[PDB]
Tab-separated table of C-alpha atoms in Angstrom:
chain	number	residue	atom	x	y	z
A	1	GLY	CA	3.425	48.269	-0.892
A	2	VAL	CA	3.403	50.980	1.774
A	3	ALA	CA	1.768	49.580	4.918
A	4	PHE	CA	1.692	46.175	6.593
A	5	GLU	CA	-0.133	44.228	9.299
A	6	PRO	CA	0.942	41.615	11.865
A	7	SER	CA	-0.468	38.232	10.841
A	8	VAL	CA	-0.069	34.758	12.346
A	9	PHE	CA	0.186	31.236	10.951
A	10	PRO	CA	-0.404	28.010	12.907
A	11	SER	CA	1.770	24.914	12.600
A	12	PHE	CA	0.503	21.410	13.325
A	13	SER	CA	2.549	18.806	15.182
A	14	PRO	CA	3.055	15.108	14.353
A	15	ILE	CA	0.058	13.992	16.411
A	16	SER	CA	-2.280	16.463	14.666
A	17	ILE	CA	-1.268	15.731	11.062
A	18	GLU	CA	-2.324	12.061	11.193
A	19	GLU	CA	-5.591	12.821	13.048
A	20	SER	CA	-7.140	14.900	10.247
A	21	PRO	CA	-10.517	14.227	8.598
A	22	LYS	CA	-9.475	13.443	5.013
A	23	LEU	CA	-5.960	12.247	5.858
A	24	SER	CA	-6.503	8.688	4.570
A	25	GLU	CA	-7.453	9.827	1.049
A	26	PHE	CA	-3.801	10.020	-0.061
A	27	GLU	CA	-1.637	6.967	-0.758
A	28	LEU	CA	0.819	7.408	2.114
A	29	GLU	CA	3.204	4.719	3.351
A	30	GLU	CA	2.575	3.858	7.003
A	31	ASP	CA	5.833	1.903	7.359
A	32	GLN	CA	8.140	4.837	6.580
A	33	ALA	CA	8.245	8.293	8.168
A	34	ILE	CA	5.214	10.074	6.700
A	35	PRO	CA	3.447	11.662	9.702
A	36	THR	CA	6.569	12.955	11.442
A	37	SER	CA	8.166	13.977	8.134
A	38	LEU	CA	5.204	16.064	6.955
A	39	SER	CA	4.996	17.884	10.299
A	40	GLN	CA	8.708	18.733	10.483
A	41	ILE	CA	8.814	19.941	6.869
A	42	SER	CA	5.870	22.282	7.492
A	43	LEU	CA	7.732	24.119	10.269
A	44	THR	CA	10.695	25.006	8.045
A	45	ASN	CA	8.406	25.930	5.140
A	46	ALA	CA	6.297	28.277	7.274
A	47	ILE	CA	9.403	29.877	8.797
A	48	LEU	CA	10.816	30.626	5.339
A	49	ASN	CA	7.556	32.246	4.217
A	50	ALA	CA	7.244	34.306	7.408
A	51	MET	CA	10.849	35.526	7.200
A	52	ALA	CA	10.470	36.501	3.536
A	53	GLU	CA	7.205	38.353	4.177
A	54	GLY	CA	8.596	39.999	7.311
B	1	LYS	CA	-4.236	20.928	-15.576
B	2	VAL	CA	-1.055	20.925	-13.478
B	3	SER	CA	0.241	23.003	-10.570
B	4	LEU	CA	4.037	22.631	-10.720
B	5	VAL	CA	4.964	25.355	-8.222
B	6	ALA	CA	8.536	25.303	-6.920
B	7	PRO	CA	10.213	27.488	-4.269
B	8	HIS	CA	11.596	30.025	-6.745
B	9	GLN	CA	9.196	30.335	-9.687
B	10	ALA	CA	5.973	28.934	-11.135
B	11	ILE	CA	6.058	26.475	-14.038
B	12	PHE	CA	2.510	25.259	-14.667
B	13	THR	CA	0.677	27.689	-12.344
B	14	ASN	CA	-2.572	27.854	-14.307
B	15	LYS	CA	-4.477	24.770	-15.462
B	16	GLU	CA	-3.277	24.497	-19.075
B	17	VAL	CA	-1.687	21.058	-19.541
B	18	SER	CA	-2.624	17.554	-20.674
B	19	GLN	CA	-0.235	14.780	-19.607
B	20	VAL	CA	2.746	14.853	-17.247
B	21	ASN	CA	5.162	12.058	-16.302
B	22	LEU	CA	7.186	12.550	-13.120
B	23	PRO	CA	9.512	10.021	-11.430
B	24	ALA	CA	8.019	9.146	-8.049
B	25	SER	CA	9.456	7.009	-5.243
B	26	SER	CA	7.634	3.807	-6.237
B	27	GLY	CA	7.904	4.031	-10.021
B	28	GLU	CA	7.835	6.285	-13.069
B	29	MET	CA	4.133	7.109	-12.999
B	30	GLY	CA	2.425	9.638	-15.242
B	31	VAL	CA	-0.710	11.685	-14.693
B	32	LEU	CA	-3.354	11.791	-17.422
B	33	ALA	CA	-6.443	14.001	-17.682
B	34	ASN	CA	-7.898	13.520	-14.164
B	35	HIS	CA	-5.706	11.199	-12.107
B	36	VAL	CA	-6.856	9.648	-8.831
B	37	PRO	CA	-5.705	11.052	-5.461
B	38	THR	CA	-2.296	9.358	-5.121
B	39	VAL	CA	-0.054	11.829	-3.274
B	40	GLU	CA	3.324	10.067	-3.232
B	41	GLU	CA	6.913	11.202	-2.779
B	42	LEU	CA	8.871	12.272	-5.861
B	43	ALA	CA	12.393	10.938	-6.392
B	44	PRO	CA	15.374	12.682	-8.158
B	45	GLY	CA	14.342	12.006	-11.741
B	46	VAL	CA	13.014	13.755	-14.855
B	47	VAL	CA	9.573	15.376	-14.712
B	48	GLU	CA	8.391	15.719	-18.314
B	49	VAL	CA	4.996	17.278	-19.060
B	50	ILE	CA	3.595	16.607	-22.531
B	51	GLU	CA	1.836	19.694	-23.927
B	52	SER	CA	-0.899	18.399	-26.250
B	53	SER	CA	1.332	17.269	-29.124
B	54	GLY	CA	5.084	16.699	-28.951
B	55	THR	CA	5.797	19.991	-27.172
B	56	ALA	CA	7.004	18.355	-23.960
B	57	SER	CA	9.406	20.185	-21.639
B	58	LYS	CA	11.841	17.907	-19.796
B	59	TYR	CA	12.343	19.361	-16.302
B	60	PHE	CA	14.933	17.582	-14.143
B	61	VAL	CA	13.332	17.794	-10.699
B	62	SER	CA	15.466	17.383	-7.580
B	63	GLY	CA	12.751	15.481	-5.698
B	64	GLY	CA	9.577	16.499	-3.905
B	65	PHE	CA	6.010	15.272	-3.399
B	66	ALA	CA	3.753	14.798	-6.435
B	67	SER	CA	0.318	15.431	-4.913
B	68	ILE	CA	-2.796	14.730	-6.998
B	69	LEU	CA	-6.223	16.132	-6.140
B	70	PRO	CA	-9.623	14.585	-6.917
B	71	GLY	CA	-10.776	17.520	-9.057
B	72	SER	CA	-8.391	17.097	-12.007
B	73	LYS	CA	-5.430	18.830	-10.368
B	74	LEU	CA	-1.794	17.718	-10.084
B	75	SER	CA	0.383	19.689	-7.650
B	76	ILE	CA	4.050	18.812	-8.225
B	77	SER	CA	5.874	20.686	-5.453
B	78	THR	CA	9.653	20.313	-5.766
B	79	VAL	CA	12.681	22.162	-4.426
B	80	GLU	CA	14.519	22.643	-7.735
B	81	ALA	CA	13.225	22.192	-11.291
B	82	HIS	CA	15.661	22.883	-14.137
B	83	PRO	CA	15.716	21.740	-17.777
B	84	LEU	CA	17.993	19.106	-19.270
B	85	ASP	CA	19.812	21.666	-21.451
B	86	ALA	CA	20.873	23.757	-18.426
B	87	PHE	CA	23.497	21.212	-17.303
B	88	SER	CA	26.985	20.544	-18.652
B	89	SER	CA	28.636	17.161	-19.124
B	90	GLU	CA	32.118	18.274	-18.042
B	91	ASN	CA	31.064	19.924	-14.769
B	92	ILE	CA	28.799	17.016	-13.793
B	93	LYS	CA	31.732	14.573	-13.772
B	94	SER	CA	33.583	16.541	-11.079
B	95	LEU	CA	30.802	16.206	-8.491
B	96	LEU	CA	30.263	12.491	-9.160
B	97	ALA	CA	33.973	11.692	-8.802
B	98	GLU	CA	34.352	13.601	-5.523
B	99	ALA	CA	31.328	11.927	-3.911
B	100	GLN	CA	32.585	8.408	-4.673
B	101	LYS	CA	36.012	8.958	-3.098
B	102	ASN	CA	34.555	10.620	0.015
B	103	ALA	CA	32.134	7.746	0.684
B	104	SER	CA	33.148	5.277	3.413
B	105	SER	CA	36.209	7.379	4.265
B	106	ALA	CA	35.287	9.111	7.548
B	107	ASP	CA	32.505	9.076	10.150
B	108	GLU	CA	29.519	11.142	11.385
B	109	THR	CA	27.291	12.221	8.446
B	110	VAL	CA	30.162	12.565	5.959
B	111	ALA	CA	29.908	9.005	4.626
B	112	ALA	CA	26.095	8.985	4.642
B	113	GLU	CA	25.773	12.208	2.627
B	114	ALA	CA	28.157	11.005	-0.102
B	115	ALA	CA	26.045	7.939	-0.944
B	116	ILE	CA	22.906	9.958	-1.717
B	117	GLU	CA	24.795	12.430	-3.926
B	118	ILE	CA	26.373	9.676	-6.035
B	119	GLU	CA	23.014	8.046	-6.823
B	120	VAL	CA	21.342	11.294	-7.910
B	121	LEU	CA	24.270	12.305	-10.138
B	122	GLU	CA	24.353	8.950	-11.952
B	123	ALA	CA	20.664	9.089	-12.909
B	124	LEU	CA	20.868	12.600	-14.382
B	125	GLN	CA	23.987	11.851	-16.448
B	126	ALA	CA	22.407	8.798	-18.113
B	127	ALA	CA	19.448	10.815	-19.469
B	128	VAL	CA	21.225	13.088	-21.938
C	1	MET	CA	-21.126	-52.082	-25.071
C	2	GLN	CA	-21.086	-51.806	-21.281
C	3	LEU	CA	-17.413	-50.811	-21.054
C	4	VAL	CA	-17.658	-48.247	-23.866
C	5	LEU	CA	-20.775	-46.621	-22.396
C	6	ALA	CA	-19.277	-46.313	-18.905
C	7	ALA	CA	-16.102	-44.592	-20.133
C	8	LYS	CA	-18.063	-41.994	-22.124
C	9	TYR	CA	-19.908	-40.653	-19.072
C	10	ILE	CA	-16.700	-40.518	-17.020
C	11	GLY	CA	-14.862	-38.669	-19.792
C	12	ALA	CA	-17.378	-35.822	-19.930
C	13	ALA	CA	-17.268	-35.385	-16.136
C	14	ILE	CA	-13.482	-35.473	-15.705
C	15	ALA	CA	-13.040	-32.970	-18.545
C	16	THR	CA	-15.361	-30.500	-16.778
C	17	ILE	CA	-12.797	-29.943	-14.004
C	18	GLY	CA	-10.962	-27.487	-16.268
C	19	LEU	CA	-13.645	-24.824	-15.812
C	20	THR	CA	-11.827	-23.440	-12.753
C	21	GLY	CA	-9.013	-22.096	-14.924
C	22	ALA	CA	-11.329	-20.635	-17.562
C	23	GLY	CA	-13.736	-19.118	-15.038
C	24	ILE	CA	-10.996	-17.472	-12.981
C	25	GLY	CA	-9.269	-16.219	-16.134
C	26	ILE	CA	-12.160	-13.948	-17.095
C	27	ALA	CA	-12.351	-12.632	-13.523
C	28	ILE	CA	-8.605	-11.942	-13.363
C	29	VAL	CA	-8.731	-9.653	-16.403
C	30	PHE	CA	-11.926	-8.015	-15.119
C	31	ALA	CA	-10.411	-7.285	-11.699
C	32	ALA	CA	-7.427	-5.437	-13.177
C	33	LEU	CA	-9.631	-3.559	-15.658
C	34	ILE	CA	-12.030	-2.352	-12.952
C	35	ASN	CA	-9.253	-1.111	-10.659
C	36	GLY	CA	-7.178	0.302	-13.525
C	37	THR	CA	-10.023	2.343	-15.013
C	38	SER	CA	-10.337	4.417	-11.824
C	39	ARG	CA	-6.961	6.067	-12.487
C	40	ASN	CA	-8.250	7.569	-15.793
C	41	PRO	CA	-8.328	7.367	-18.670
C	42	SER	CA	-8.139	3.715	-19.733
C	43	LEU	CA	-11.868	2.962	-19.934
C	44	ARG	CA	-12.861	3.675	-23.546
C	45	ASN	CA	-9.282	3.348	-24.852
C	46	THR	CA	-5.812	2.141	-23.814
C	47	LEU	CA	-6.978	-0.772	-21.654
C	48	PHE	CA	-10.146	-1.188	-23.753
C	49	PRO	CA	-8.278	-3.025	-26.540
C	50	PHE	CA	-6.351	-5.115	-24.018
C	51	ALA	CA	-9.479	-6.228	-22.145
C	52	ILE	CA	-11.233	-7.458	-25.297
C	53	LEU	CA	-8.142	-9.195	-26.688
C	54	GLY	CA	-7.085	-10.586	-23.307
C	55	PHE	CA	-10.477	-12.145	-22.591
C	56	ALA	CA	-10.468	-14.044	-25.896
C	57	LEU	CA	-7.133	-15.726	-25.138
C	58	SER	CA	-8.238	-16.884	-21.682
C	59	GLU	CA	-11.539	-18.211	-23.064
C	60	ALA	CA	-9.768	-20.517	-25.537
C	61	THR	CA	-8.985	-23.023	-22.773
C	62	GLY	CA	-12.648	-23.498	-21.866
C	63	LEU	CA	-13.896	-23.973	-25.426
C	64	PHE	CA	-11.197	-26.511	-26.326
C	65	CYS	CA	-11.749	-28.559	-23.157
C	66	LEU	CA	-15.535	-28.618	-23.627
C	67	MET	CA	-15.257	-30.052	-27.150
C	68	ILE	CA	-13.661	-33.306	-25.965
C	69	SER	CA	-16.300	-33.787	-23.250
C	70	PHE	CA	-19.319	-33.521	-25.566
C	71	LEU	CA	-17.693	-35.785	-28.185
C	72	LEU	CA	-17.040	-38.632	-25.721
D	1	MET	CA	-27.510	-52.149	-17.795
D	2	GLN	CA	-25.853	-51.875	-14.385
D	3	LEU	CA	-22.673	-50.286	-15.766
D	4	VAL	CA	-24.542	-47.575	-17.689
D	5	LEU	CA	-26.625	-46.577	-14.659
D	6	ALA	CA	-23.564	-46.438	-12.393
D	7	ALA	CA	-21.725	-44.018	-14.695
D	8	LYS	CA	-24.752	-41.718	-15.014
D	9	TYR	CA	-24.845	-40.839	-11.308
D	10	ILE	CA	-21.061	-40.419	-11.128
D	11	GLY	CA	-21.074	-38.010	-14.078
D	12	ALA	CA	-23.068	-35.353	-12.217
D	13	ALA	CA	-20.643	-35.374	-9.254
D	14	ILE	CA	-17.230	-35.048	-10.919
D	15	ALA	CA	-18.539	-32.376	-13.302
D	16	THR	CA	-19.733	-30.250	-10.357
D	17	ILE	CA	-16.149	-29.628	-9.194
D	18	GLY	CA	-15.904	-26.658	-11.572
D	19	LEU	CA	-18.041	-24.473	-9.294
D	20	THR	CA	-14.915	-23.235	-7.485
D	21	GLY	CA	-13.856	-21.145	-10.478
D	22	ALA	CA	-17.348	-19.780	-11.107
D	23	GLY	CA	-18.134	-19.143	-7.441
D	24	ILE	CA	-14.878	-17.354	-6.635
D	25	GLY	CA	-14.904	-15.567	-9.998
D	26	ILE	CA	-17.967	-13.472	-9.176
D	27	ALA	CA	-16.382	-12.384	-5.877
D	28	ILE	CA	-13.038	-11.356	-7.399
D	29	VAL	CA	-14.681	-8.764	-9.650
D	30	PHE	CA	-16.860	-7.492	-6.788
D	31	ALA	CA	-13.960	-7.117	-4.341
D	32	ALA	CA	-11.909	-4.939	-6.698
D	33	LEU	CA	-14.950	-2.831	-7.619
D	34	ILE	CA	-16.045	-2.166	-4.028
D	35	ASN	CA	-12.550	-1.054	-2.989
D	36	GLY	CA	-12.187	1.257	-5.997
D	37	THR	CA	-15.576	2.964	-5.858
D	38	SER	CA	-14.914	4.447	-2.398
D	39	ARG	CA	-12.182	6.751	-3.768
D	40	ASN	CA	-12.246	8.172	-7.322
D	41	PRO	CA	-15.066	8.149	-8.025
D	42	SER	CA	-18.668	6.925	-7.958
D	43	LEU	CA	-20.419	3.613	-8.612
D	44	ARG	CA	-23.297	4.544	-10.957
D	45	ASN	CA	-21.138	4.583	-14.112
D	46	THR	CA	-17.654	3.749	-15.414
D	47	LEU	CA	-17.053	0.804	-13.080
D	48	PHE	CA	-20.779	-0.044	-13.119
D	49	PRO	CA	-20.638	-1.161	-16.774
D	50	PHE	CA	-17.521	-3.267	-16.235
D	51	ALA	CA	-18.939	-5.003	-13.151
D	52	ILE	CA	-22.160	-6.048	-14.900
D	53	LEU	CA	-20.430	-7.184	-18.099
D	54	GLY	CA	-17.557	-8.834	-16.229
D	55	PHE	CA	-19.805	-10.956	-14.014
D	56	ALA	CA	-21.757	-12.320	-16.990
D	57	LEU	CA	-18.592	-13.588	-18.692
D	58	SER	CA	-17.237	-15.398	-15.622
D	59	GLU	CA	-20.612	-17.030	-14.882
D	60	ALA	CA	-20.698	-18.767	-18.281
D	61	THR	CA	-18.423	-21.572	-17.051
D	62	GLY	CA	-20.886	-22.641	-14.358
D	63	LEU	CA	-23.902	-22.760	-16.668
D	64	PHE	CA	-22.053	-24.701	-19.377
D	65	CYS	CA	-20.670	-27.275	-16.929
D	66	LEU	CA	-24.084	-27.812	-15.313
D	67	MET	CA	-25.704	-28.785	-18.627
D	68	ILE	CA	-23.413	-31.783	-19.144
D	69	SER	CA	-23.977	-32.986	-15.567
D	70	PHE	CA	-27.787	-32.923	-15.759
D	71	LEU	CA	-27.905	-34.612	-19.187
D	72	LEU	CA	-25.892	-37.658	-18.056
E	1	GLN	CA	-26.613	-53.006	-6.304
E	2	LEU	CA	-24.711	-50.927	-8.856
E	3	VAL	CA	-27.404	-48.241	-9.106
E	4	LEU	CA	-27.721	-47.884	-5.321
E	5	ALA	CA	-23.956	-47.650	-4.775
E	6	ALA	CA	-23.601	-44.857	-7.349
E	7	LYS	CA	-26.208	-42.697	-5.593
E	8	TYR	CA	-24.029	-42.208	-2.506
E	9	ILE	CA	-20.996	-41.140	-4.554
E	10	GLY	CA	-23.093	-38.662	-6.552
E	11	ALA	CA	-23.545	-36.380	-3.533
E	12	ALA	CA	-20.050	-36.745	-2.023
E	13	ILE	CA	-17.855	-35.765	-4.981
E	14	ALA	CA	-20.323	-33.036	-5.990
E	15	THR	CA	-19.777	-31.262	-2.649
E	16	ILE	CA	-16.214	-30.287	-3.621
E	17	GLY	CA	-17.540	-27.046	-5.127
E	18	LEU	CA	-18.126	-25.536	-1.677
E	19	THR	CA	-14.558	-24.178	-1.624
E	20	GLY	CA	-15.386	-21.495	-4.186
E	21	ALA	CA	-18.729	-20.626	-2.600
E	22	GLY	CA	-17.337	-20.546	0.939
E	23	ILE	CA	-14.263	-18.454	0.147
E	24	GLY	CA	-16.256	-16.176	-2.163
E	25	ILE	CA	-18.491	-14.910	0.637
E	26	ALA	CA	-15.418	-13.988	2.701
E	27	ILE	CA	-13.463	-12.381	-0.155
E	28	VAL	CA	-16.257	-9.890	-0.852
E	29	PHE	CA	-16.602	-9.089	2.861
E	30	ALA	CA	-12.852	-8.585	3.346
E	31	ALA	CA	-12.657	-5.816	0.740
E	32	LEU	CA	-15.780	-4.108	2.105
E	33	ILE	CA	-14.548	-4.157	5.712
E	34	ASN	CA	-11.133	-2.733	4.798
E	35	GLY	CA	-12.668	-0.091	2.524
E	36	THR	CA	-15.303	1.134	4.979
E	37	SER	CA	-12.609	2.434	7.356
E	38	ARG	CA	-11.356	4.915	4.726
E	39	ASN	CA	-14.226	7.375	5.481
E	40	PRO	CA	-17.084	7.112	4.931
E	41	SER	CA	-18.683	4.184	3.090
E	42	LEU	CA	-21.181	3.145	5.773
E	43	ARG	CA	-24.873	3.779	5.120
E	44	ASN	CA	-25.882	2.503	1.659
E	45	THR	CA	-23.306	3.107	-1.116
E	46	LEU	CA	-21.028	0.160	-0.329
E	47	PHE	CA	-23.826	-1.716	1.473
E	48	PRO	CA	-25.778	-2.198	-1.776
E	49	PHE	CA	-22.805	-3.620	-3.682
E	50	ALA	CA	-21.889	-6.016	-0.864
E	51	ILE	CA	-25.422	-7.410	-0.536
E	52	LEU	CA	-25.878	-7.799	-4.296
E	53	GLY	CA	-22.364	-9.170	-4.790
E	54	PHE	CA	-22.768	-11.848	-2.123
E	55	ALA	CA	-25.974	-13.169	-3.706
E	56	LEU	CA	-24.314	-13.621	-7.108
E	57	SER	CA	-21.401	-15.574	-5.621
E	58	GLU	CA	-23.784	-17.761	-3.595
E	59	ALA	CA	-25.700	-18.846	-6.713
E	60	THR	CA	-23.008	-21.409	-7.553
E	61	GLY	CA	-23.397	-23.208	-4.223
E	62	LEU	CA	-27.188	-23.422	-4.360
E	63	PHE	CA	-27.125	-24.710	-7.944
E	64	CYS	CA	-24.506	-27.381	-7.210
E	65	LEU	CA	-26.308	-28.607	-4.078
E	66	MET	CA	-29.544	-29.238	-5.998
E	67	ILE	CA	-28.065	-31.935	-8.252
E	68	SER	CA	-26.471	-33.739	-5.289
E	69	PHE	CA	-29.615	-33.911	-3.127
E	70	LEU	CA	-31.800	-35.062	-6.049
E	71	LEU	CA	-30.308	-38.580	-6.039
F	1	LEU	CA	-22.208	-52.440	-2.479
F	2	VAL	CA	-24.793	-50.363	-0.623
F	3	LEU	CA	-22.991	-50.591	2.727
F	4	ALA	CA	-19.558	-49.954	1.193
F	5	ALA	CA	-20.740	-46.795	-0.588
F	6	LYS	CA	-22.080	-45.243	2.629
F	7	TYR	CA	-18.636	-45.067	4.253
F	8	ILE	CA	-17.004	-43.385	1.246
F	9	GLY	CA	-19.817	-40.828	1.011
F	10	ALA	CA	-18.894	-39.218	4.333
F	11	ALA	CA	-15.201	-38.933	3.358
F	12	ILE	CA	-15.288	-37.529	-0.185
F	13	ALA	CA	-17.867	-34.932	0.888
F	14	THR	CA	-15.441	-33.510	3.476
F	15	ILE	CA	-13.283	-31.907	0.763
F	16	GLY	CA	-15.309	-28.694	1.076
F	17	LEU	CA	-13.798	-27.858	4.469
F	18	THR	CA	-10.950	-25.936	2.806
F	19	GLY	CA	-13.255	-23.078	1.812
F	20	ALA	CA	-14.948	-22.805	5.206
F	21	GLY	CA	-11.711	-22.935	7.201
F	22	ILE	CA	-9.891	-20.387	5.046
F	23	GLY	CA	-12.959	-18.134	4.923
F	24	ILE	CA	-12.895	-17.482	8.666
F	25	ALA	CA	-9.244	-16.399	8.425
F	26	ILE	CA	-9.711	-14.186	5.356
F	27	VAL	CA	-12.418	-12.106	7.038
F	28	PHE	CA	-10.418	-11.929	10.283
F	29	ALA	CA	-7.256	-10.746	8.513
F	30	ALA	CA	-8.965	-7.711	6.974
F	31	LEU	CA	-10.713	-6.830	10.245
F	32	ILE	CA	-7.526	-7.010	12.332
F	33	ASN	CA	-5.472	-4.993	9.835
F	34	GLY	CA	-8.210	-2.387	9.395
F	35	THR	CA	-8.824	-1.921	13.119
F	36	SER	CA	-5.258	-0.675	13.688
F	37	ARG	CA	-5.765	2.240	11.263
F	38	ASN	CA	-7.666	4.345	13.871
F	39	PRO	CA	-10.305	3.717	14.991
F	40	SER	CA	-12.572	0.851	13.872
F	41	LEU	CA	-13.039	-0.691	17.318
F	42	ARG	CA	-16.504	-0.295	18.886
F	43	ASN	CA	-19.064	-1.709	16.418
F	44	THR	CA	-18.424	-0.753	12.761
F	45	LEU	CA	-15.809	-3.392	11.933
F	46	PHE	CA	-16.545	-5.497	15.032
F	47	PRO	CA	-20.270	-5.793	14.228
F	48	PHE	CA	-19.705	-6.748	10.578
F	49	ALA	CA	-17.273	-9.536	11.509
F	50	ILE	CA	-19.944	-11.520	13.367
F	51	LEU	CA	-22.513	-11.200	10.572
F	52	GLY	CA	-19.962	-11.701	7.794
F	53	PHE	CA	-18.621	-14.927	9.295
F	54	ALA	CA	-22.069	-16.554	9.209
F	55	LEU	CA	-22.243	-16.298	5.410
F	56	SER	CA	-18.843	-17.953	4.956
F	57	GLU	CA	-19.650	-20.690	7.492
F	58	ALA	CA	-22.941	-21.562	5.765
F	59	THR	CA	-21.110	-23.613	3.126
F	60	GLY	CA	-19.460	-25.835	5.735
F	61	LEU	CA	-22.675	-26.554	7.630
F	62	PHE	CA	-24.639	-27.387	4.472
F	63	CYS	CA	-21.934	-29.698	3.103
F	64	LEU	CA	-21.619	-31.541	6.426
F	65	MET	CA	-25.329	-32.423	6.444
F	66	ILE	CA	-25.036	-34.483	3.252
F	67	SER	CA	-22.064	-36.472	4.583
F	68	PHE	CA	-23.676	-37.302	7.941
F	69	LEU	CA	-26.988	-38.355	6.358
F	70	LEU	CA	-25.381	-41.123	4.276
F	71	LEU	CA	-23.937	-42.830	7.378
F	72	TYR	CA	-27.153	-42.635	9.440
F	73	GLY	CA	-30.052	-42.623	6.961
């Protein structure tokens, strides 16, 4: 509550979210948008957390 | 043991729950003690969590992704989670009437956005 | 009699064709109980009373069909 | 007795048609148990008791139908 | 000639039970092949249930073929 | 009666071909649908399909031996 530090957070794309190790453990629908939807929602969620912390 | 963390406050936070029934995209499924890993999308329904006895708290979730872990953990991440007593019956009729008249009346994303708002308002008004 | 003795052996064999419905009935309730118990917790309760009561109703077709075969 | 001997050999063939329910019944309980043990949770308990008790109930139709075919 | 004619029909109609024994070996292998790609039921684990499950389903075909070949 | 029963023995015994024909398609349907889930291609699912098809085809070869023996011996 006085000082700060410059951190960084990585964001995966649509091709990296479906190529994970334990990605098939969840009941995800392959017919609908699940890989591209989870990657696009993570970019807006990480930008909101970085703007609030900044 | 639930983890209902929204984007404004924490509901469950710590693991101190028993049963929880949340409306998902497929059906109205409910988690028990240690549910299996079935991370599915949550629809705009009522997410009630029974606390031991009959001390359940009806939380009208706006839709999210009810993720379940394999170690007796249920993470219900939603955008908005309000109770059933925090909504009025007179003010809810104004939004449902304006979305029905605006549907199929223009172009672009004006007609497509009115159809999703009319379906979510009709499900919340029938559970009073 | 030759005609009465020939019809008795054919009656016990034709009545044994009904075992496909009784054998698959016990496996149908066991397949849903094995997959449904993994969700927790319907092993010792909930589905426990339905598996015992559901298996007795499906087994009534095999016991009734076997009584007419042994009596002919 | 030519008619009695002809019906004795035909009784063991028509009664053996019930093996389709007993043969496919043991595989229906094993297919749902193998696909459920790979995710939540193990295979040494819970589903292990239902697979052993479920296979013994579905196999009773094949043993009961084989006794009437060998005694005719 | 009635006893000799009934011996040929005793092994033909009794072979109808091969539908349950033939499809049972493929039903147990279809669930194991689709479940092994979910990471990582390969060595043992699912291999012991598939080998023991296939022998129990094949007991109906070996028992039905003994009464047909004994004529 | 002996010669007339030999022709019907090779026809009624052919009813077991429904399990052997459908068994080759049931094992091939799970292998084709599971291979497109990334990446059961080399071995793994391809090696189990050759060994798994021999167990399902054993019922058709054993049932065909009893039908052919009545018409020749």
